[PDB]
RNA sequence: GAGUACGGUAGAGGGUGGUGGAAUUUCCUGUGUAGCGGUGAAAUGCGUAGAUAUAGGAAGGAACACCAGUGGCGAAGGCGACCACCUGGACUGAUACUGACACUGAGGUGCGAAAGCGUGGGGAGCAAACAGGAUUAGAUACCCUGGUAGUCCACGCCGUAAACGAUGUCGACUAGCCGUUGGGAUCGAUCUUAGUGGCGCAGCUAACGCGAUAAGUCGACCGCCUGGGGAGUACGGCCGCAAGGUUAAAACUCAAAUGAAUUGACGGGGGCCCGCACAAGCGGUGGAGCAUGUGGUUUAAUUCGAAGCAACGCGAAGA
């Protein structure tokens, strides 16, 4: 309930093939406001949509005007849908994006993935 | 069809009002080529409407028409294992079809004593948006709105 | 990949940009290349039949 | 022909140590609040005992993105991070040297994927067995959430694979064209040498197809086959700690089993096109009463025929 100001944030978009998190944080990695495909009120097929993860964006910007942020600079990681729909959602939520930057983890050989579905 | 060959035709003839729309509105109350016999209710429908108050009648019929035609249709279809239902705007003749086809089928089943009556109670009420058919409209929107996920 | 928005511009040539970069950079293609395990017998089967295709679409050429 | 000495090249060839960066997992801490994860749809599962997300830090193990390629090296199995050390072979050029010193090879000896086994370490991910949730008529399966042997290391055993080019090794001849890897000569081009690929004349083949990397024309040596099952099984021997390997029959039974290609048909294979086939609509049948045909039952007889669509108001346009 105690008040805090933050200018210029950092959104982090965290797409998969399932569903969207969306996560505003200052500069030291600590969120003020959080939002997800999910608990947009979705809940299936509806959640791996680029609709979803806009309103997702939508909501966690409202959240975040707050305390104010003024600016924000993207990561995105993921291979899913929403990944470009949560940031023309962020813009139009009314910040000024700086940057966008693609932060997908990519391992070199790393640990062996899991068994091929026969589907 | 698969040709699409297909060619409207242009019967449209209205006696004594000179309105285009109501032609296509009694048509739509024929049953069995009787077109006197829907002459007859559709008329006696609107004097009803302009002895209850001042409005010119015809002209609450198109205020009734612009108040009952859907802007959004929900159209079907199956994506392999479930049936989704995407939105789709509707075309500028399906929608007062649409409209006359509800208006009429609901105005059928309201329970006055004769169908001119019914009729006109169901213009009298759509005016303003209080009819079964208006809230059938209002059903159609929010299912429509309810699946704007798919929409494109 | 990344980019950056820099001399006033539209909000619709930075995002395209920026999945123009992603695409020359290929983040999703690794992404699916890493969804399951290929065996390395999958794995040479593949490039013995890209390299078949490879080599019949450049002598097509004439 | 086959070897030696001398410069010089290219290489995931082999062994022993050391060290890197990305990523996953667990653990500690800060912010933060109601979901996360998964699916065709779910549910199990994880979360208000504060999860997923996000930022900082630590521990450990395994695999080595891009380069990467009809590319390279090795007798084969096989071998991809970087560095040092130990070490095998191939290619290439000039001169000199030995003087047939060669090829093949039953026994025999050695190397030999993965799984498996023994003793001792290690434990991130994945995952036989196992448990739960779905799906289903059932589902000891596919699918989801977990998860132990094993996968990793050292030493020892095992000795098998569609261990395949389904093509034994060595040598000599027989039109060409187009790429590529290591390397020489001549004036980017030409020639030449050892590999690695795509077409193709003769010739060969049952055909598919092979075609200087022959399945063509020849020579030297070796291994193997003799209709399909029974059966690569039984018994005996030899190996193995075990699993099992290897060598290897018969009675009986059948008149076929088979290879390549051809015509059609079919496909929960592909591409184009069509039809009240869907879609968009209007009126109905299945419910009631009656008419009428049929099945079944009954009767002395209920006269014969029509039986998915393509029988049943049909032969019958008149019991
Ligand atoms: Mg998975
Ligand atoms: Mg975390
Ligand atoms: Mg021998
Ligand atoms: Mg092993
Ligand atoms: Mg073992
Ligand atoms: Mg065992
Ligand atoms: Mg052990
Ligand atoms: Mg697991
Ligand atoms: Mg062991
Ligand atoms: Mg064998
Ligand atoms: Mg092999
Ligand atoms: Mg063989
Ligand atoms: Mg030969
Ligand atoms: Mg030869
Ligand atoms: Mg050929
Ligand atoms: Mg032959
Ligand atoms: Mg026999
Ligand atoms: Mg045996
Ligand atoms: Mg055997
Ligand atoms: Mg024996
Ligand atoms: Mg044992
Ligand atoms: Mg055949
Ligand atoms: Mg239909
Ligand atoms: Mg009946
Ligand atoms: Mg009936
Ligand atoms: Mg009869
Ligand atoms: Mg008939």
């Known amino acids: 309930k105690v008040k805090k100001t933050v200018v210029d944030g950092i959104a982090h978009i965290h797409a998969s093939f399932n569903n969207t998190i969306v996560t505003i944080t200052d500069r030291q990695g600590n969120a003020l406001s959080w939002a ?4 947009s009120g979705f809940r299936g097929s509806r ?22 942020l003024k600016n924000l600079d993207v990561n995105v990681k993921g291979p899913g ?38 589907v | ?44 429908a609107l004097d009803k409407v302009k002895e209850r108050g001042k409005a010119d009648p015809l002209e609450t019929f198109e ?4 108040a009952i035609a859907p802007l959004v249709e929900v159209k079907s279809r199956r994506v392999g294992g479930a049936t989704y239902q995407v939105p789709v705007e509707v075309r500028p003749s399906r929608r007062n079809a649409l409209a006359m086809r509800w ?13 001119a009556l019914r009729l006109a109670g169901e213009l009298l009420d759509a005016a303003e948006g209080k009819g079964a058919a208006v809230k059938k409209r209002e059903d159609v929107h929010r299912m429509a709105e309810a699946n704007k996920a798919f929409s494109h | ?19 123009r970069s992603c695409e020359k950079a290929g983040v999703l293609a ?19 039949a890209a390299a078949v295709k490879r080599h019949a679409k450049k002598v097509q050429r004439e």
């Open chain 2, 103 to 115: 208006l009429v089928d609901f105005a059928r089943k309201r329970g006055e004593k004769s169908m």
């Open chain 2, 63 to 66: 205020k009734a028409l612009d």
């Open chain 3, 1 to 19: 990949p990344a980019v950056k928005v820099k001399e006033n511009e539209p909000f619709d040539v930075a995002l395209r940009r920026f999945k």
């Open chain 1, 81 to 118: 849908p929403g990944r470009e729909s949560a940031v023309r959602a962020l813009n139009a939520c009314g910040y000024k994006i700086a940057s966008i930057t693609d932060v997908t983890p990519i391992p070199h050989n790393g640990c062996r993935p899991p068994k091929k579905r026969r």
């Open chain 2, 1 to 44: 069809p698969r040709r699409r060959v297909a060619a409207k035709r242009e019967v449209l003839a209205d006696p004594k009002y000179g309105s285009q729309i109501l032609a296509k509105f009694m048509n739509h109350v024929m049953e069995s080529g009787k077109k006197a016999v829907a002459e007859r209710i559709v008329y006696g």
């Open chain 1, 36 to 39: 997800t495909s999910g608990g």
């Open chain 3, 30 to 48: 690794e992404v699916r290349s890493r969804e399951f395990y290929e065996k390395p017998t999958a794995e040479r089967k593949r490039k013995a």
């Open chain 1, 47 to 68: 959640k791996s949509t680029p609709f979803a993860a806009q309103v997702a964006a939508e909501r966690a910007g409202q959240a975040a005007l707050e305390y104010g």
